[PDB]
Short mmCIF file of C-alpha atoms and ligand atoms in Angstrom, two decimals:
data_model
loop_
_atom_site.label_atom_id
_atom_site.label_comp_id
_atom_site.label_asym_id
_atom_site.label_seq_id
_atom_site.Cartn_x
_atom_site.Cartn_y
_atom_site.Cartn_z
CA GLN V 4 20.75 107.74 46.76
CA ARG V 5 18.30 104.83 46.59
CA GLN V 6 19.68 101.27 46.52
CA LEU V 7 17.82 97.94 46.43
CA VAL V 8 19.30 94.98 48.44
CA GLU V 9 17.93 91.43 47.85
CA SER V 10 18.18 88.49 50.29
CA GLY V 11 16.86 84.95 50.92
CA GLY V 12 18.45 83.14 48.02
CA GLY V 13 19.51 79.56 48.67
CA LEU V 14 19.18 75.83 47.82
CA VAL V 15 15.87 73.93 48.29
CA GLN V 16 14.03 70.65 47.47
CA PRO V 17 11.19 70.73 44.84
CA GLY V 18 8.00 71.27 46.79
CA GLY V 19 9.82 73.35 49.39
CA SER V 20 9.70 77.09 50.02
CA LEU V 21 11.76 80.32 50.00
CA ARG V 22 11.03 83.94 51.02
CA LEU V 23 12.97 86.53 48.98
CA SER V 24 13.13 90.01 50.53
CA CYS V 25 14.22 93.25 48.83
CA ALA V 26 14.88 96.28 51.03
CA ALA V 27 15.37 99.80 49.70
CA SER V 28 17.21 102.88 51.11
CA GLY V 29 14.15 105.05 50.76
CA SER V 30 10.38 104.95 51.14
CA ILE V 31 8.47 102.47 48.94
CA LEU V 32 5.61 105.03 48.98
CA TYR V 33 7.60 107.01 46.33
CA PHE V 34 7.76 103.97 44.03
CA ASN V 35 5.09 103.36 41.40
CA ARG V 36 5.81 99.71 40.72
CA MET V 37 7.91 97.13 42.55
CA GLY V 38 8.58 93.67 41.18
CA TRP V 39 10.65 90.51 40.80
CA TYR V 40 12.41 89.42 37.57
CA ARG V 41 14.40 86.13 37.09
CA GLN V 42 17.28 85.10 34.81
CA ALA V 43 18.27 81.46 34.33
CA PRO V 44 21.65 80.60 32.73
CA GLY V 45 21.64 81.58 29.05
CA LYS V 46 18.13 83.05 28.87
CA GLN V 47 16.27 86.39 28.60
CA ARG V 48 14.79 88.39 31.52
CA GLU V 49 11.48 86.90 32.78
CA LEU V 50 9.06 88.91 34.98
CA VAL V 51 7.52 86.66 37.66
CA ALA V 52 5.61 89.19 39.82
CA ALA V 53 4.83 92.90 40.29
CA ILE V 54 2.97 95.12 42.78
CA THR V 55 1.81 98.68 42.01
CA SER V 56 1.27 101.58 44.39
CA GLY V 57 -2.42 100.85 43.79
CA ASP V 58 -2.07 97.46 45.57
CA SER V 59 -2.72 95.43 42.34
CA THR V 60 -0.60 92.26 41.96
CA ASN V 61 0.20 90.51 38.62
CA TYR V 62 2.09 87.24 37.93
CA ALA V 63 3.46 85.21 35.01
CA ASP V 64 1.53 81.99 34.12
CA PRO V 65 4.35 79.61 35.27
CA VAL V 66 4.52 80.97 38.85
CA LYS V 67 0.74 81.84 39.08
CA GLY V 68 -0.95 79.99 41.95
CA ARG V 69 2.42 79.18 43.57
CA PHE V 70 4.08 82.60 44.25
CA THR V 71 2.72 85.67 46.18
CA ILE V 72 4.17 89.22 45.93
CA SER V 73 3.81 91.09 49.23
CA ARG V 74 4.86 94.53 50.47
CA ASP V 75 5.63 96.08 53.87
CA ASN V 76 5.80 99.90 53.69
CA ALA V 77 7.03 100.01 57.35
CA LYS V 78 10.07 97.83 56.69
CA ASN V 79 10.45 99.39 53.19
CA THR V 80 10.56 95.89 51.71
CA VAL V 81 9.00 93.88 48.84
CA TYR V 82 8.73 90.10 49.37
CA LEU V 83 8.42 87.01 47.16
CA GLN V 84 7.03 83.97 49.02
CA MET V 85 7.87 81.09 46.72
CA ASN V 86 5.87 77.95 47.70
CA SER V 87 5.80 74.48 46.06
CA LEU V 88 9.07 75.03 44.15
CA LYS V 89 10.09 73.28 40.85
CA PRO V 90 13.38 72.85 38.85
CA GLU V 91 12.06 75.27 36.17
CA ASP V 92 12.16 78.04 38.83
CA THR V 93 15.97 77.79 39.25
CA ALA V 94 17.42 81.24 38.34
CA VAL V 95 18.99 84.51 39.62
CA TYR V 96 16.14 86.60 41.08
CA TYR V 97 16.37 90.44 40.73
CA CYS V 98 14.36 93.17 42.48
CA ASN V 99 13.07 96.12 40.39
CA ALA V 100 11.52 99.49 41.36
CA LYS V 101 10.08 102.28 39.13
CA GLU V 102 9.65 105.97 40.30
CA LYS V 103 7.89 108.81 38.49
CA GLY V 104 9.80 112.02 38.82
CA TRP V 105 8.31 115.37 39.77
CA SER V 106 8.32 116.01 36.02
CA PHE V 107 7.08 113.66 33.28
CA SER V 108 10.08 111.21 33.30
CA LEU V 109 10.65 108.01 35.38
CA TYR V 110 13.55 106.17 37.07
CA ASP V 111 14.22 102.37 36.97
CA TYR V 112 16.20 100.88 39.89
CA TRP V 113 17.69 97.38 40.15
CA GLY V 114 19.37 95.23 42.79
CA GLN V 115 22.42 92.92 43.02
CA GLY V 116 20.48 89.73 42.41
CA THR V 117 19.83 86.70 44.65
CA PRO V 118 20.46 83.10 43.51
CA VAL V 119 17.73 80.45 44.00
CA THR V 120 18.58 76.82 43.27
CA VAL V 121 15.96 74.07 43.15
CA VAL V 122 17.80 70.77 42.98
CA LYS V 123 16.64 67.17 43.21
CA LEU V 124 18.84 64.13 42.81
CA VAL V 125 16.86 61.42 41.01
CA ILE V 126 18.05 57.83 40.70
CA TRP V 127 16.70 55.08 38.44
CA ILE V 128 17.27 51.49 39.72
CA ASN V 129 15.28 48.27 39.13
CA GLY V 130 12.53 47.21 41.56
CA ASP V 131 14.16 43.87 42.29
CA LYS V 132 17.12 45.77 43.89
CA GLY V 133 17.52 47.57 47.23
CA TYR V 134 16.06 51.00 46.56
CA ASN V 135 15.02 51.47 50.22
CA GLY V 136 18.63 50.98 51.27
CA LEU V 137 19.82 53.22 48.44
CA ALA V 138 17.42 55.82 49.88
CA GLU V 139 19.01 55.48 53.36
CA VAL V 140 22.33 56.49 51.70
CA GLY V 141 20.49 59.34 49.98
CA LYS V 142 19.06 60.46 53.34
CA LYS V 143 22.59 60.68 54.82
CA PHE V 144 23.65 62.71 51.73
CA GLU V 145 20.89 65.32 52.35
CA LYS V 146 22.04 65.67 55.99
CA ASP V 147 25.63 66.47 54.90
CA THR V 148 24.74 68.70 51.86
CA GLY V 149 21.07 69.70 51.63
CA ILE V 150 20.22 67.99 48.30
CA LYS V 151 17.13 65.71 48.06
CA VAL V 152 17.77 62.12 46.95
CA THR V 153 14.60 60.43 45.59
CA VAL V 154 14.93 56.81 44.35
CA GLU V 155 12.62 55.66 41.50
CA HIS V 156 11.97 52.13 40.11
CA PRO V 157 9.89 52.30 36.88
CA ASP V 158 8.95 49.28 34.74
CA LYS V 159 11.03 48.71 31.57
CA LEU V 160 13.65 51.31 32.70
CA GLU V 161 16.35 49.67 30.51
CA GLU V 162 14.32 50.68 27.38
CA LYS V 163 12.51 53.75 28.92
CA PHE V 164 15.85 55.46 29.88
CA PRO V 165 17.28 55.83 26.32
CA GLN V 166 13.96 57.30 25.08
CA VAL V 167 13.28 59.70 28.02
CA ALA V 168 16.94 60.68 28.71
CA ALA V 169 17.50 61.57 25.04
CA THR V 170 14.51 63.91 24.73
CA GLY V 171 13.29 64.80 28.23
CA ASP V 172 15.19 65.06 31.51
CA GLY V 173 14.89 61.55 32.94
CA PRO V 174 17.25 60.59 35.78
CA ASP V 175 20.58 62.01 36.94
CA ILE V 176 22.08 58.60 37.61
CA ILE V 177 21.00 55.26 35.96
CA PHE V 178 21.57 51.81 37.56
CA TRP V 179 21.63 48.66 35.38
CA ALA V 180 23.96 45.70 34.52
CA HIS V 181 26.98 46.88 32.43
CA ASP V 182 25.73 45.16 29.21
CA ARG V 183 23.14 47.92 28.40
CA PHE V 184 25.66 50.79 28.85
CA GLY V 185 27.57 50.43 25.56
CA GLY V 186 24.42 51.27 23.64
CA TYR V 187 23.88 54.36 25.80
CA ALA V 188 27.56 55.36 25.29
CA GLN V 189 27.39 55.00 21.47
CA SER V 190 24.15 57.03 21.40
CA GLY V 191 25.70 59.77 23.55
CA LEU V 192 23.36 59.35 26.52
CA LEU V 193 26.15 59.04 29.18
CA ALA V 194 28.77 61.41 30.61
CA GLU V 195 32.40 60.24 30.80
CA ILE V 196 33.42 59.15 34.33
CA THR V 197 36.61 60.82 35.67
CA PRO V 198 37.45 59.35 39.10
CA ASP V 199 40.73 60.24 40.87
CA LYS V 200 43.39 57.49 41.39
CA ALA V 201 42.62 57.12 45.11
CA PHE V 202 38.90 56.46 44.47
CA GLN V 203 39.79 54.29 41.42
CA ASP V 204 42.11 52.16 43.57
CA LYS V 205 39.30 51.29 46.08
CA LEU V 206 37.60 48.97 43.50
CA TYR V 207 38.96 45.76 41.84
CA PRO V 208 40.69 46.53 38.47
CA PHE V 209 38.67 43.81 36.65
CA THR V 210 35.41 45.61 37.64
CA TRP V 211 36.52 48.85 35.91
CA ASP V 212 37.05 46.94 32.63
CA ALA V 213 33.33 46.02 32.43
CA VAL V 214 32.40 49.74 32.57
CA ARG V 215 34.73 50.80 29.69
CA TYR V 216 33.65 51.60 26.08
CA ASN V 217 36.26 52.78 23.51
CA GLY V 218 38.83 53.68 26.17
CA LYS V 219 36.42 55.78 28.24
CA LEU V 220 34.91 54.93 31.67
CA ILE V 221 31.11 55.12 31.17
CA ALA V 222 29.89 54.07 34.68
CA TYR V 223 30.89 53.19 38.28
CA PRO V 224 31.04 49.41 39.03
CA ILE V 225 28.95 48.35 42.07
CA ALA V 226 28.70 44.55 42.18
CA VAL V 227 29.09 41.32 40.22
CA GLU V 228 25.82 39.45 39.64
CA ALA V 229 25.32 35.80 38.71
CA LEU V 230 22.34 33.43 38.88
CA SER V 231 22.51 30.43 41.27
CA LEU V 232 20.25 27.50 42.10
CA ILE V 233 18.15 28.44 45.12
CA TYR V 234 16.67 25.32 46.82
CA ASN V 235 14.47 24.38 49.79
CA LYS V 236 16.63 22.17 52.07
CA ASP V 237 13.57 20.66 53.78
CA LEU V 238 11.80 19.59 50.56
CA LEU V 239 15.13 18.69 48.87
CA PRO V 240 18.30 18.05 51.00
CA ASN V 241 20.52 16.69 48.18
CA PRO V 242 19.43 18.77 45.14
CA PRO V 243 20.09 17.88 41.48
CA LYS V 244 23.64 18.30 40.20
CA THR V 245 22.37 17.67 36.62
CA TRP V 246 19.47 19.19 34.58
CA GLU V 247 18.57 15.76 33.12
CA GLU V 248 17.55 14.33 36.55
CA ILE V 249 14.90 17.07 37.22
CA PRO V 250 12.06 15.24 35.34
CA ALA V 251 12.46 12.24 37.67
CA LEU V 252 12.51 14.50 40.73
CA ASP V 253 9.44 16.36 39.43
CA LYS V 254 7.46 13.11 39.07
CA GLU V 255 8.38 12.35 42.71
CA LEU V 256 7.40 15.84 43.94
CA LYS V 257 4.15 16.19 41.89
CA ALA V 258 2.81 13.11 43.73
CA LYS V 259 3.17 15.08 47.02
CA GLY V 260 1.51 18.23 45.59
CA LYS V 261 4.77 20.09 44.91
CA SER V 262 6.74 21.35 41.87
CA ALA V 263 10.48 20.69 41.36
CA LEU V 264 11.68 23.85 39.63
CA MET V 265 9.94 27.19 38.99
CA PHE V 266 11.83 30.17 37.55
CA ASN V 267 11.30 33.16 35.22
CA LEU V 268 10.90 31.77 31.67
CA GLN V 269 9.84 35.12 30.16
CA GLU V 270 13.18 36.97 30.68
CA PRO V 271 15.98 35.26 28.62
CA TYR V 272 18.68 35.94 31.26
CA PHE V 273 17.21 33.10 33.32
CA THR V 274 16.93 30.54 30.46
CA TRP V 275 20.31 31.40 28.84
CA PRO V 276 22.45 29.24 31.24
CA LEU V 277 20.68 26.05 30.08
CA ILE V 278 20.78 27.18 26.42
CA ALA V 279 24.53 28.00 26.67
CA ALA V 280 25.57 24.91 28.70
CA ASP V 281 27.15 23.06 25.73
CA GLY V 282 27.54 25.97 23.31
CA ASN V 302 24.83 25.89 16.88
CA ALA V 303 24.45 22.32 18.25
CA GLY V 304 24.63 23.53 21.85
CA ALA V 305 21.78 26.03 21.60
CA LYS V 306 19.60 23.40 19.87
CA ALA V 307 20.29 20.86 22.65
CA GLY V 308 19.76 23.21 25.56
CA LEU V 309 16.53 24.73 24.25
CA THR V 310 14.98 21.37 23.19
CA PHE V 311 15.39 20.26 26.84
CA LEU V 312 13.65 23.44 28.06
CA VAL V 313 10.87 22.84 25.50
CA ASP V 314 10.47 19.22 26.67
CA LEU V 315 9.95 20.41 30.31
CA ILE V 316 6.91 22.52 29.28
CA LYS V 317 5.75 19.75 26.88
CA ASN V 318 5.89 17.17 29.75
CA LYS V 319 3.86 19.60 32.00
CA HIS V 320 6.77 19.88 34.49
CA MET V 321 6.93 23.69 34.11
CA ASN V 322 4.10 26.20 33.34
CA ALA V 323 3.94 27.98 29.97
CA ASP V 324 3.82 31.59 31.28
CA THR V 325 6.09 31.24 34.34
CA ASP V 326 7.19 34.78 35.34
CA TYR V 327 9.34 36.34 38.10
CA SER V 328 6.41 36.89 40.49
CA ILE V 329 4.65 33.49 40.42
CA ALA V 330 8.06 31.71 40.58
CA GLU V 331 9.28 33.80 43.57
CA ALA V 332 5.97 33.51 45.39
CA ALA V 333 5.78 29.76 44.82
CA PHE V 334 9.28 29.18 46.23
CA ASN V 335 8.75 31.49 49.22
CA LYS V 336 5.35 29.86 49.93
CA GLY V 337 6.99 26.43 49.89
CA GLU V 338 5.31 25.07 46.74
CA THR V 339 8.46 24.52 44.58
CA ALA V 340 11.67 22.77 45.73
CA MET V 341 13.94 24.88 43.49
CA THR V 342 14.28 28.28 41.73
CA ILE V 343 16.89 30.15 39.63
CA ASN V 344 17.61 33.73 40.84
CA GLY V 345 20.23 36.29 41.91
CA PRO V 346 21.60 37.78 45.15
CA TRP V 347 18.79 40.34 45.27
CA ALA V 348 16.18 37.55 45.75
CA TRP V 349 17.62 36.22 49.02
CA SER V 350 16.18 38.84 51.43
CA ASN V 351 12.58 37.95 50.44
CA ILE V 352 13.29 34.26 51.17
CA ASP V 353 14.73 35.22 54.61
CA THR V 354 11.47 37.12 55.27
CA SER V 355 9.59 33.85 54.63
CA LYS V 356 10.04 30.73 56.80
CA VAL V 357 11.94 28.67 54.19
CA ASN V 358 15.29 27.01 55.07
CA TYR V 359 17.02 27.80 51.76
CA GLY V 360 20.29 27.00 50.07
CA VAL V 361 22.13 28.67 47.17
CA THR V 362 24.27 26.39 44.99
CA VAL V 363 25.86 25.57 41.62
CA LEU V 364 23.46 25.60 38.67
CA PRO V 365 22.66 22.12 37.29
CA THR V 366 24.94 20.66 34.56
CA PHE V 367 23.55 19.82 31.10
CA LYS V 368 25.14 17.15 28.86
CA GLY V 369 27.85 16.79 31.52
CA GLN V 370 29.19 20.31 30.94
CA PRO V 371 28.10 23.21 33.23
CA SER V 372 25.29 25.70 32.58
CA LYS V 373 27.03 28.99 31.69
CA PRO V 374 25.07 31.88 33.27
CA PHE V 375 25.76 35.39 31.99
CA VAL V 376 27.62 37.63 34.43
CA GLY V 377 26.44 41.15 35.11
CA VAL V 378 28.21 44.05 36.76
CA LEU V 379 25.67 46.35 38.43
CA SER V 380 26.88 49.80 37.39
CA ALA V 381 25.91 53.45 38.02
CA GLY V 382 26.17 55.90 35.10
CA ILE V 383 25.61 59.70 34.96
CA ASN V 384 23.06 60.98 32.35
CA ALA V 385 24.73 63.21 29.72
CA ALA V 386 21.75 65.61 29.82
CA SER V 387 21.96 66.25 33.60
CA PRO V 388 22.95 69.52 35.33
CA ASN V 389 23.84 67.69 38.59
CA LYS V 390 26.89 65.80 37.19
CA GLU V 391 29.30 66.93 39.94
CA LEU V 392 26.68 66.39 42.71
CA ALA V 393 26.04 62.82 41.46
CA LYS V 394 29.81 62.10 41.35
CA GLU V 395 29.94 63.16 45.04
CA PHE V 396 27.04 60.88 45.94
CA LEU V 397 28.45 57.92 44.01
CA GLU V 398 32.05 58.25 45.27
CA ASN V 399 31.95 59.57 48.85
CA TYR V 400 28.54 58.20 49.95
CA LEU V 401 27.49 55.08 47.91
CA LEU V 402 30.80 53.34 46.98
CA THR V 403 31.88 53.16 50.60
CA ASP V 404 31.81 50.39 53.20
CA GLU V 405 28.96 52.09 55.01
CA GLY V 406 27.11 52.92 51.81
CA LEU V 407 27.15 49.47 50.22
CA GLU V 408 26.21 47.95 53.60
CA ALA V 409 22.98 49.93 53.62
CA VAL V 410 22.01 48.72 50.14
CA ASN V 411 23.04 45.16 50.96
CA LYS V 412 20.95 44.83 54.15
CA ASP V 413 17.85 45.80 52.13
CA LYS V 414 18.38 43.46 49.14
CA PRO V 415 21.82 41.75 48.63
CA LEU V 416 24.11 43.20 45.95
CA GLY V 417 26.12 40.07 45.37
CA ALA V 418 29.91 40.27 45.09
CA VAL V 419 30.63 43.92 45.62
CA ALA V 420 33.30 45.74 43.65
CA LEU V 421 34.77 47.30 46.81
CA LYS V 422 38.17 45.85 47.82
CA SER V 423 37.45 46.39 51.51
CA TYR V 424 34.49 43.99 51.39
CA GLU V 425 36.45 40.84 50.50
CA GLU V 426 36.47 39.36 54.01
CA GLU V 427 32.73 39.83 54.48
CA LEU V 428 31.95 38.41 51.03
CA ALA V 429 34.11 35.36 51.65
CA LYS V 430 32.27 34.64 54.98
CA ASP V 431 28.92 34.24 53.15
CA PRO V 432 28.07 30.78 51.74
CA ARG V 433 25.64 32.18 49.16
CA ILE V 434 28.33 34.43 47.73
CA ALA V 435 30.56 31.41 47.32
CA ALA V 436 27.81 29.74 45.24
CA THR V 437 27.36 32.97 43.25
CA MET V 438 31.10 33.16 42.48
CA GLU V 439 31.05 29.49 41.55
CA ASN V 440 28.40 30.12 38.91
CA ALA V 441 30.09 33.36 37.77
CA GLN V 442 33.31 31.48 36.98
CA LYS V 443 31.33 28.82 35.06
CA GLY V 444 29.63 31.63 33.15
CA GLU V 445 31.06 34.68 31.38
CA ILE V 446 30.83 38.48 31.53
CA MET V 447 28.54 40.06 28.93
CA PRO V 448 30.13 42.32 26.32
CA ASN V 449 28.89 45.91 26.69
CA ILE V 450 28.51 46.40 22.87
CA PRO V 451 25.58 48.38 21.35
CA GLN V 452 24.20 45.24 19.63
CA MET V 453 23.36 43.61 23.06
CA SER V 454 19.81 45.12 22.95
CA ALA V 455 18.94 43.59 19.58
CA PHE V 456 20.55 40.33 20.74
CA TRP V 457 18.52 40.12 23.96
CA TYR V 458 15.27 40.87 22.05
CA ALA V 459 16.08 38.09 19.56
CA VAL V 460 16.55 35.60 22.42
CA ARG V 461 13.47 36.90 24.35
CA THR V 462 11.17 36.21 21.38
CA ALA V 463 12.86 32.91 20.46
CA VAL V 464 12.41 31.45 23.97
CA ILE V 465 8.76 32.67 24.29
CA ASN V 466 7.78 31.31 20.84
CA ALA V 467 9.30 27.87 21.58
CA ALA V 468 7.77 27.86 25.09
CA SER V 469 4.22 28.70 24.01
CA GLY V 470 4.26 26.48 20.94
CA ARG V 471 4.51 28.65 17.81
CA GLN V 472 7.97 28.25 16.21
CA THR V 473 10.20 25.13 16.14
CA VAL V 474 13.62 24.93 17.93
CA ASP V 475 15.46 24.84 14.55
CA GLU V 476 13.46 27.84 13.23
CA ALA V 477 14.10 29.82 16.46
CA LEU V 478 17.89 29.90 16.00
CA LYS V 479 17.40 30.76 12.28
CA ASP V 480 15.43 33.95 13.02
CA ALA V 481 17.74 34.81 15.95
CA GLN V 482 21.03 34.58 13.98
CA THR V 483 19.73 37.06 11.33
O1 LIG U 1 16.40 39.11 30.53
C1 LIG U 1 17.32 39.70 29.70
C2 LIG U 1 17.93 40.91 30.43
O2 LIG U 1 18.81 40.27 31.30
C3 LIG U 1 19.68 41.03 32.03
O3 LIG U 1 18.95 41.77 32.95
C4 LIG U 1 18.89 41.24 34.22
C5 LIG U 1 19.60 42.19 35.18
O4 LIG U 1 20.92 42.22 34.82
C6 LIG U 1 19.49 41.63 36.59
O5 LIG U 1 20.01 42.56 37.48
C7 LIG U 1 18.07 41.19 36.93
O6 LIG U 1 17.42 42.21 37.57
O7 LIG U 1 17.27 40.75 35.88
C8 LIG U 1 17.42 41.24 34.59
C9 LIG U 1 16.59 40.23 33.77
O8 LIG U 1 15.33 40.04 34.34
C10 LIG U 1 20.50 42.00 31.17
O9 LIG U 1 21.23 42.82 32.00
C11 LIG U 1 19.56 42.85 30.31
O10 LIG U 1 20.17 43.62 29.34
C12 LIG U 1 18.62 41.94 29.50
O11 LIG U 1 17.62 42.75 28.96
#
């Protein structure tokens, strides 16, 4: 009898290629039509290509321009050269042949089927982090498996993820501080994390608590993040221990064509430590001081991450407020820098919010088990976290094995100092609305629109 046998089905990276081949146990000359049909999980049969005895070739609009149906009557084989592959292609590919009998009737013949998988691992992490290093981990993953690991860093990913991941595909794995994850968990945008005891035991038990919402693990903890006072040792050997002595220092420095302190005033995460130093009466005190700095022309009105960073690295400002991630760019520059305790306000310390960098798996992802493999066996390893850390520092890693190395770093000590003086952010769904309320409040008071008393009024509502 006549039997069709398909081959060439495997795993590939989008943009890659695959040659399917279907050999018959009889001459193709006898066939009228030969063609390729595909079936994806839970869907109807979809013709992709066909070739008639008359040498005419037809294709479906999705594959048109990308796929070519070929035939070799010597080898008694029909081919499907699939170029520039996409995730929509992923399906079981079947070979079909039609034969007119001697009489009026015809015969349809089918094959076993050949599986084609187009898989890409996509990761969303912020641009201020070590995406290049995260890619080096992803490159080792592809060597040991065959899956592509692209690393993306889009603007406003914290508020682009819940919109795109809900409707569209978005990323497989999302990287952000633990505070944003409760809102994703409530909305149903994250898969429940199920790590075995042995993996679980590799990380500090306090770190796991930050990535827990209603008794379910919603992410993998990576590292603890806290803002510190970054200062130029040459321009300022004995930096301010108090916030209230910065105006004096600024007067001194402005005479020599230099600023005292430049940091991101737009993002409320950077201004919150000063606001929360005393506490309400504490928020009113802390903000009024911040307002007086802009009013006394000590700080610029629209001071953002880029002009603050650049100014410090250039050697224009004596101080800056930033996280572990910012250190590598300073090292690149020729600035003898120091990382230390944040200045105190009204005697009491400035309480910076503490973030736990965490990796979560998107609920609407087909690569949930592949991402778990990447996160556990490749990223959350000594070797894996090292790679990320040499690009842009992670801070105080969640890995137990890294304690000695963390403790040997003076900047980590300063980070941990500030983290103890601060507090970990609750993961709750209301954090988004809270942060927005503070973001507006600080900008309005900074520019000169709303009063300090009226800012806390609108923010408490
Ligand atoms: O600015 C408010 C913003 O702050 C925090 O985001 C930090 C993030 O945690 C850090 O890793 C760093 O990259 O900067 C961000 C602020 O610029 C909160 O995690 C976030 O929810 C909040 O929107």
